[PDB]
Amino acid sequence: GFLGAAGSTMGAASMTLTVQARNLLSGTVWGIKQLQARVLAVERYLRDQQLLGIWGCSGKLICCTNVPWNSSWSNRNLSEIWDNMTWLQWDKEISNYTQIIYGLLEESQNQQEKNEQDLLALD
Amino acid sequence: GFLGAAGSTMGAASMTLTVQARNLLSGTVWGIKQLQARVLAVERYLRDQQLLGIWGCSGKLICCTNVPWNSSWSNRNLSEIWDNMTWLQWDKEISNYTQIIYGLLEESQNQQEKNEQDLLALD
Amino acid sequence: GFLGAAGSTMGAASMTLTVQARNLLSGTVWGIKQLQARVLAVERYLRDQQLLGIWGCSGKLICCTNVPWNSSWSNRNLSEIWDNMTWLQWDKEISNYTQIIYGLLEESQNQQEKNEQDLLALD
Amino acid sequence: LWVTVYYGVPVWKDAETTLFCASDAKAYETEKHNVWATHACVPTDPNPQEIHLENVTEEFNMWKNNMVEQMHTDIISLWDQSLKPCVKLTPLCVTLQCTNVTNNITDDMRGELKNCSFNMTTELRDKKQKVYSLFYRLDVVQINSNKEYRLINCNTSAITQACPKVSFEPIPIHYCAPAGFAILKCKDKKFNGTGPCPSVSTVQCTHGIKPVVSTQLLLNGSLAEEEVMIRSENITNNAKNILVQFNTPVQINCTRPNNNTRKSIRIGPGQAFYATGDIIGDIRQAHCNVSKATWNETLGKVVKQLRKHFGNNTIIRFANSSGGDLEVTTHSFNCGGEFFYCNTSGLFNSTWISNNDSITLPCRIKQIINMWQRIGQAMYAPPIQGVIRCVSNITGLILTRDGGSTNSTTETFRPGGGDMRDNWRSELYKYKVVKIEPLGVAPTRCKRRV
Amino acid sequence: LWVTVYYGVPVWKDAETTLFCASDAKAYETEKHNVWATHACVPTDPNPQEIHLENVTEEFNMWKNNMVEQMHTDIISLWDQSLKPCVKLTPLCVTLQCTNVTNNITDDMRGELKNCSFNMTTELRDKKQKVYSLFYRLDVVQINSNKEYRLINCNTSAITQACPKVSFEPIPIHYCAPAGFAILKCKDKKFNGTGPCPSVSTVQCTHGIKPVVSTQLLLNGSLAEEEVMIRSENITNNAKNILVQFNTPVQINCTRPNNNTRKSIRIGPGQAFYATGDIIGDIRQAHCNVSKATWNETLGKVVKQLRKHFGNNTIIRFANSSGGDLEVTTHSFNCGGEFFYCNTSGLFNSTWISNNDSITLPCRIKQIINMWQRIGQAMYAPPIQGVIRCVSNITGLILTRDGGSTNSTTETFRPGGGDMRDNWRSELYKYKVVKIEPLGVAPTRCKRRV
Amino acid sequence: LWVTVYYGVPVWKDAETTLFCASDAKAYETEKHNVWATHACVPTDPNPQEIHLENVTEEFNMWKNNMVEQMHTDIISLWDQSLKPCVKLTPLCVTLQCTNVTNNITDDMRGELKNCSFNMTTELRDKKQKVYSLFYRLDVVQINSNKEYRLINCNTSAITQACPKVSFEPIPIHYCAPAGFAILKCKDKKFNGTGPCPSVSTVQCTHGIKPVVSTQLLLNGSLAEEEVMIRSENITNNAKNILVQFNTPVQINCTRPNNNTRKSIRIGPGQAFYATGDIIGDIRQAHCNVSKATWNETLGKVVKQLRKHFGNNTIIRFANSSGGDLEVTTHSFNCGGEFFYCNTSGLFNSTWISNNDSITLPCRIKQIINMWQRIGQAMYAPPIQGVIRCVSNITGLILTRDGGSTNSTTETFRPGGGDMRDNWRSELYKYKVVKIEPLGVAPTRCKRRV
Ligand SMILES: *[C@@H]1O[C@H](CO)[C@@H](O[C@@H]2O[C@H](CO)[C@@H](O[C@@H]3O[C@H](CO[C@H]4O[C@H](CO)[C@@H](O)[C@H](O)[C@@H]4O)[C@@H](O)[C@H](O[C@H]4O[C@H](CO)[C@@H](O)[C@H](O)[C@@H]4O[C@H]4O[C@H](CO)[C@@H](O)[C@H](O)[C@@H]4O)[C@@H]3O)[C@H](O)[C@H]2NC(C)=O)[C@H](O)[C@H]1NC(C)=O
Ligand SMILES: *[C@@H]1O[C@H](CO)[C@@H](O[C@@H]2O[C@H](CO)[C@@H](O[C@@H]3O[C@H](CO[C@H]4O[C@H](CO)[C@@H](O)[C@H](O)[C@@H]4O)[C@@H](O)[C@H](O[C@H]4O[C@H](CO)[C@@H](O)[C@H](O)[C@@H]4O[C@H]4O[C@H](CO)[C@@H](O)[C@H](O)[C@@H]4O)[C@@H]3O)[C@H](O)[C@H]2NC(C)=O)[C@H](O)[C@H]1NC(C)=O
Ligand SMILES: *[C@@H]1O[C@H](CO)[C@@H](O[C@@H]2O[C@H](CO)[C@@H](O[C@@H]3O[C@H](CO[C@H]4O[C@H](CO)[C@@H](O)[C@H](O)[C@@H]4O)[C@@H](O)[C@H](O[C@H]4O[C@H](CO)[C@@H](O)[C@H](O)[C@@H]4O[C@H]4O[C@H](CO)[C@@H](O)[C@H](O)[C@@H]4O)[C@@H]3O)[C@H](O)[C@H]2NC(C)=O)[C@H](O)[C@H]1NC(C)=O
Ligand SMILES: *[C@@H]1O[C@H](CO)[C@@H](O[C@@H]2O[C@H](CO)[C@@H](O)[C@H](O)[C@H]2NC(C)=O)[C@H](O)[C@H]1NC(C)=O
Ligand SMILES: *[C@@H]1O[C@H](CO)[C@@H](O[C@@H]2O[C@H](CO)[C@@H](O)[C@H](O)[C@H]2NC(C)=O)[C@H](O)[C@H]1NC(C)=O
Ligand SMILES: *[C@@H]1O[C@H](CO)[C@@H](O[C@@H]2O[C@H](CO)[C@@H](O)[C@H](O)[C@H]2NC(C)=O)[C@H](O)[C@H]1NC(C)=O
Ligand SMILES: *[C@@H]1O[C@H](CO)[C@@H](O)[C@H](O)[C@H]1NC(C)=O
Ligand SMILES: *[C@@H]1O[C@H](CO)[C@@H](O)[C@H](O)[C@H]1NC(C)=O
């Protein structure tokens, strides 16, 4: 269900990716209460949708990138993350590099990628 | 024009796909009247955009899927649908399976698909 | 920065494509002042996002098309545009054909394209 | 076969939603400090699109059309919100020292006015103001030395004056659907307002509808094409209203044949009450004229149509109102900002089996009114000096039918109304709101890749 | 390894946001012209989802939960916006010619009412109205020939009457998070409201919470599971309130044993003041009953729990209020639209070392109140004729502890409260709002193409 | 070549839109129950970004800049919405029994105050209150036994008092564009406000602008860089205002050399009128000081600049106001919550061909004002006891030019103003709003696939 795998491992929590993006939308004062909330609800959806878009993905759920993992980012092995760890605990670590990693995606990639495609599309 | 082929056949109504998605956006009380309406107008756009996204399409207009057609879904032949029928009359039939078919798209496909791509992308 | 290359050449201004789409979102009366503004802010984002979508792109930044350039559109050579000109000065020219060119993208292409793909996907 | 999703498919279904309004570019230019409501609305489309939906049949129900209800609630709110920053007359409830019109020679309509002198507040909380005004009988009621009087609302509600800046003058209003929604418009000539339409269109906005508030007679509305048309919720239910739409308009000429005086009485600070000064002219009861021959041509055409519902050769009777509140026993409407109440006995008094000057209605003017059966906001309309004349098109009727049947033998019809929702229906009958759902999923021989 | 973005990951963190309300389908059907607020809210979910978050532990803090604050501000606004279109009693500040109850035989509660005759405005600004009403001592204050009196708010604020249409009757209200946000719900049986929860769930809406306004005793709330539970912000801080939640409910039976009269006094135009007519019955002080044995079972269970915090074998003392505003020195609540103020000395007067009829509280009724420490909107509740009785469940307490320690020797407890925020906390303790951020980025052996 | 769409291209064009405000973090901490408006605004950006637009030239027009209009309408609304929950003084229109200042020795400014005794309402609708206050001549007007007086607004509008909680004290306000829009900022040192800017920037917010309301002299504004700068809509149109911006600020020292008394008069229930008690001090006309030498240095620099527009060697004359409403014939402003009206004859009285103590302005204080040419909301500012002193920077002027030419011979200048829109322009001159359109389509040798 909603936040079903929230406590499961990150590799297991990859199954509930469909549930989180699904319920992320849901379709005289005291009526404006819900208005201003559901306005922000849209804005929160589009923030991530734009980030997802301006990066190497723009398709939802999963995408890969050409950014190499900086191993000072608190490195653990592939079995020490997906099958040893939960996403919330994971967000409790890379929180510092979150703003840092995001930048490498939008500029260092898609601006590089789609311009790399410009000079190779001319023929 | 707007709802031009609404009365034509489903195969013919596939031509007016461009007109429907186009005009689907259009760009002190009594001003909030239009506000709350045009807020919902956005929300209605994003509901379908998200469904379209979380399914095997995310590109607009047309997409295919790997879900086989359950022939108890009120089966008719390909000439008995596209060239014999109108979309409204068609929506007057599968209305029951609408909520049912939609589910097979988001979970049984993209969660299956993009995870099927995960283990084949590692090499 | 924001509108950094706004004065540079169109070929140079292609580098700041990432900055413009980024800051295009940013995340009792006198509170509704910001509300109605940020509502329209969403609507302005989705207008272009839909146009971008219904055309041959739907991925952001750059896309190409199968529409041939009508040379009465105020033709200049490829060195007389990208490396000789600024985008604002460029928008000061094709402003007439803007509404005209946009139409060839949504209908004459994607409605043609994705239907051309329909009859070739059946096998 | 495989499921295939299609975006932007022509799918819709009946729905109710919140609409928006349009009112030209011309209705804003009128200004005069926001006449009616048009201050926040957006412009009407110069080139409104009406698109015929080829080979489309759709069911409509004019009696269960939420557009009607939305308009009703809007105009209520509009009235409510336009009278609030205006002058508030609550101190105007004061013992009224009042006599009959002094008259002269001789007697025709006697007590239509009073001379009412009252102690009133000035700008200041100290010294009173002993001054007077003119008032109609419908405005003022006696309660028991000369006779003693008070305002007719004083035991009912709260009075506050229409601001002289704004103006009650219908303008055309279009109602429009937001994105994702559409208005369907039935174009068949003969249509009773309920059932399947063969020529259906979609529009962004309705036609321009003047929110004309009136009873018994529908004024300045749309006429039915080629033939007078009858619309009713249940023809055998004597409790249900019957709406009539004409083919040919009937001119109606009304006048207030009294030049008047605007006497500004200062009940400050800042609040200015406009009193009725005197009468410049002979003392004349207003009246409305209809062409007898024209009215008779209309009645001939209306009766024949009614027999198709009530059966082939029956007696059709027209009679006056059965009783009830003043709002429903007269033809009420407004002219030059003034409220007319007209006796329609001369209009509804005829018997038609299957096989020429002026009709004058003895109208009466009331100044204090509270429509829409609201109790607790009273409104006062200040006198508009000068000769008041207006000319309108009678374009429809609101009628009722007697219940004592006579069920296959004869039918009797009387003017009726009172529920203003019926007025809106007569214009909105051809419209309904639907929501769009651009998704649809369909089988075909296409499948996606691995 | 390469960075990989994942959309819709179960990530959240504490956040404060604007919530929305739900109130069944049944709470709208009640109608009576919008009882409480439910006019704009959306419906409660028929099948609310509560999802256990497997293997999830989350920290909660009931004392720093913005849901509590939002509810508080909402009900303030609600009260504020529901009394504005209603009758405004500002002219009711008038010299009150007032005597004691005439009484008869003999003396029990004497001055609980007055007979107050006052000059008052009619519909009109001319002739006065010399008429009277009944008023409680808590309503009216003397200021210095018979004694002279005035309303107790007249030097404080502005009076305006509760509209007889609406009704102060708590209904269950659910609070819900918008999209992108979620409510987490702690399900551990023994939970003090602050710390890590082992059984956490997520819900769209809270349970239905009746916004019962009361002091000293919590009524009709949720009870703690298996055992009486104690919640306090700082047990060693004598300035901090202590919230108690019971396991077993205690029935409380209250009555206003006086049939009354609704005497409608017209202070127009349109404004109708409902006066208190007379007493039909014997003149009886209201009262609330609790079962002595039941109350005693409760006190036995409450004391034992307190010793776990204050240590093993110490004396626990219950005593009455220390003083302060009337709102905090009595148990205040409402019944049948009427405001009760009850002496709780009989409830809080016992000493418990470590090892049967009715309790009657001498309540008093006030009609003029201004809660939430607001100064400048006064409210008047009109009399509700008839026998007024109510039965509630005492489900919790708001207590304070003396500061003169006696720190390891004995403890003394007194009823307290006054900050209504503490009432909301007792139901919302198990909820907190968090925001969702469906992005997350992770290393793996996948890289994209050229 | 083939069409290629590019998203996020640096395209913009002039547009008008709805802006939002920012006001630091410090302007909220001020509190005092929401001083000015800052209660709903968002915080200013700590690190505002101003980005130079390299090699960009843009046309600006400070006279047709909708930012100015939006600010104007906002501050109007602000004033309107901040005086509504406050005390309403409508009963204060009462016959005023009023004498001159008794004076003593001898005569300097005589009738600047009155002693006004009036019958007033208490908390109650019965017994009056015979009490008094002090009032300025500008506040009160006579109408024809000692002389009889009334408030100057009583025939104009409705009075209601500024709530003593809030405070009219400009704070810096930034104006900001929402997403999809941007503010362009011209940075050229010499710029008249209309034409092409060579150093253009984009910002999220304007600089912090104090909404200082004043006439004739601009106070605490921005100064022009290196040189005094002149800005006018049409230099040859004698009907157009001329805005002057200084390079060097001029200190202005004002004082109300009277200790005062706040006498709280209760006009209840709940409404408390603050009367003016008495004078503690000698009876002294307020005054504003400017340094003669400093003022003279300024005038020297201002005149030379004017000759570049009016031609090389002409006579420049400064003279006092030509007449008109009090708002434009004095330098008006506020200090310590009090409204000063200052005679500027001593400031504008000089003749400058091409080749030291204090200036004292005989100010007058009015308490009742209604700015923005609004008729129907009056406002009363209560006395602020104590010595009132303030010091401001004169940073600009609003001037007019005589039409009787003398067209190439000489020019005469007088202080002017009255349209407060001109005040906002002097700060906003370097800003304009534009909308962004991230689409653009361009030819290249790239085409897509089949
Ligand atoms: C069904 O439809 C018909 C026609 O569509 C409609 O008839 C109209 O009646 C209204 C009155 O109810 C008329 O409106 C008034 O007309 C007079 C006369 O207008 C003449 O001049 C204009 C040129 O301006 C000509 O085009 C026209 O043909 C006439 O020769 C005007 O004087 C009235 O103006 C006043 O009212 C306005 C709106 O209320 C105000 O904005 C305006 O300021 C005026 O108010 C003030 O005027 C004075 C200041 O000078 C002041 O002293 C007064 O005290 C007052 O406060 C008004 O426009 C309208 O013209 C008629 N239509 C036509 C085509 O002539 C029926 O009424 C309608 N049926 C129903 C039931 O409504
Ligand atoms: C803790 O929780 C308990 C129970 O959950 C609660 O007890 C409830 O007390 C309230 C009073 O405060 C009761 O509400 C009133 O009940 C009487 C009697 O109801 C009988 O009839 C119904 C059938 O309709 C039976 O189901 C029921 O069991 C009883 O036998 C009603 O007469 C009252 O109606 C009036 O108030 C309504 C709301 O305020 C109005 O909508 C309604 O129109 C009535 O108002 C008017 O009525 C007359 C018109 O006929 C008019 O003349 C009057 O002047 C008046 O203006 C009201 O519903 C409620 O029933 C009790 N609960 C139960 C289960 O019986 C405790 O109060 C609560 N604790 C606290 C502190 O609140
Ligand atoms: C152009 O710009 C200049 C400077 O930028 C500006 O000068 C300022 O004038 C205003 C008055 O209009 C001054 O504001 C008042 O200042 C006094 C004195 O402040 C002293 O103390 C502070 C420490 O707190 C020192 O930092 C400062 O330097 C002074 O030594 C204050 O006493 C005033 O407080 C009252 O007003 C506040 C806002 O209105 C209220 O929030 C506050 O509660 C006070 O109100 C009440 O106070 C009493 C309660 O104790 C009560 O009894 C009173 O009746 C009253 O109701 C106020 O802050 C400001 O300080 C000056 N600026 C500087 C730097 O000193 C010019 O005015 C400006 N030009 C124009 C035209 O505006
Ligand atoms: C409405 O009809 C009445 C009656 O037909 C008209 O009254 C006439 O008025 C004129 C002059 O005012 C008199 O000379 C006639 O004697 C009246 N009666 C008749 C029968 O003509 C009235 O003028 C008409 N009003 C309008 C506006 O046409
Ligand atoms: C609450 O308790 C009091 C006291 O126990 C009850 O008062 C009794 O009332 C009856 C009839 O009204 C009398 O006959 C008794 O003498 C009273 N006292 C006792 C001790 O019974 C009162 O009735 C109770 N109220 C309710 C609603 O139960
Ligand atoms: C503003 O200027 C006037 C006049 O220059 C000053 O008035 C002086 O006040 C002092 C004491 O108040 C007297 O001793 C002087 O005789 C006055 N006149 C002169 C010429 O000095 C006034 O003090 C100044 N105000 C401020 C705040 O500086
Ligand atoms: C609780 O109160 C005590 C003193 O009563 C104080 O020392 C302590 O810091 C407070 N907070 C705690 C214990 O978290
Ligand atoms: C300025 O005013 C002059 C006359 O004073 C007029 O001729 C001219 O058109 C106006 N506008 C300009 C110069 O732009």
Side-chain angles (χ1 to χ4, degrees), chain F residues 253-255 284 287-290 357-360 389-391:
Chain F
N253 287 4
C254 307
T255 44
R284 293 183 55 194
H287 67 276
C288 290
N289 289 340
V290 174
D357 192 340
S358 280
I359 302 172
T360 293
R389 175 176 70 83
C390 290
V391 175

Side-chain angles (χ1 to χ4, degrees), chain E residues 32 167 169-170 212 219-220 262 334-336 384-385 390-392:
Chain E
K32 295 306 181 185
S167 187
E169 191 77 351
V212 188
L219 303 179
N220 293 348
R262 174 173 291 188
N334 67 311
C335 182
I384 284 290
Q385 66 284 343
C390 290
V391 175
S392 309

Side-chain angles (χ1 to χ4, degrees), chain E residues 10 20 33 44 57 81 158 167-168 185 187 197 200 216 229 246 266-267 339 347 364 384 435 440 443 445:
Chain E
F20 65 99
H33 297 166
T44 305
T57 295
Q81 300 276 16
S167 187
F168 200 76
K185 180 185 174 186
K187 300 186 299 177
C197 187
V200 184
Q216 304 207 351
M229 287 306 293
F246 304 154
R266 311 184 70 181
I267 316 179
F339 301 111
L347 293 187
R364 189 152 191 82
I384 284 290
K435 62 167 170 186
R445 44 175 180 252

Side-chain angles (χ1 to χ4, degrees), chain A residues 1-8 10 13 16-18 20-21 23-26 29-31 33-34 36-38 40-41 44-45 47-49 51-52 55-57 60-69 73 76 78 81-82 87-88 90-91 94 98 101-102 105 109-110 113 116, chain E residues 1-13 17-22 36-42 51-56 58 70 73-75 77-78 81 173 175 178-182 184 202 204 434-450:
Chain A
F2 186 76
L3 295 174
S8 303
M10 298 173 58
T16 44
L17 295 181
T18 46
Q20 299 306 130
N23 285 98
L24 208 57
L25 200 53
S26 303
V29 209
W30 184 253
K33 206 71 174 183
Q34 326 190 313
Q36 188 177 1
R38 75 179 190 175
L40 182 64
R44 182 163 191 82
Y45 172 75
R47 179 182 66 94
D48 305 322
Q49 274 288 114
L51 293 184
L52 187 72
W55 302 343
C57 345
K60 302 169 188 172
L61 308 176
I62 305 177
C63 70
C64 297
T65 59
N66 294 329
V67 181
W69 187 256
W73 277 350
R76 300 175 175 181
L78 295 174
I81 299 174
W82 308 100
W87 265 105
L88 280 177
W90 181 258
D91 199 271
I94 315 210
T98 43
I101 294 179
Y102 290 171
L105 308 180
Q109 283 298 325
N110 278 25
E113 168 196 353
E116 202 91 18
Chain E
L1 303 179
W2 308 84
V3 183
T4 46
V5 188
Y6 301 94
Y7 193 69
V9 294
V11 173
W12 72 72
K13 183 183 179 179
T17 187
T18 294
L19 303 170
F20 65 99
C21 59
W36 203 72
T38 282
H39 179 287
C41 303
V42 142
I51 309 177
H52 181 249
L53 301 178
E54 193 64 21
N55 305 330
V56 161
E58 187 80 331
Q70 294 202 43
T73 64
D74 275 352
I75 304 178
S77 76
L78 190 160
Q81 300 276 16
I173 301 121
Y175 280 100
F181 296 81
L184 299 190
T202 185
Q204 283 180 12
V434 298
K435 62 167 170 186
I436 301 181
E437 45 178 349
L439 286 186
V441 285
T444 187
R445 44 175 180 252
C446 174
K447 60 179 177 181
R448 269 195 291 101
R449 299 177 181 177
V450 179

Side-chain angles (χ1 to χ4, degrees), chain E residues 404-425:
Chain E
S405 59
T406 43
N407 219 39
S408 178
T409 68
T410 68
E411 302 284 345
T412 300
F413 299 103
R414 309 177 184 271
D419 185 348
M420 300 179 192
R421 292 172 187 87
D422 292 329
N423 301 331
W424 319 142
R425 279 176 189 113

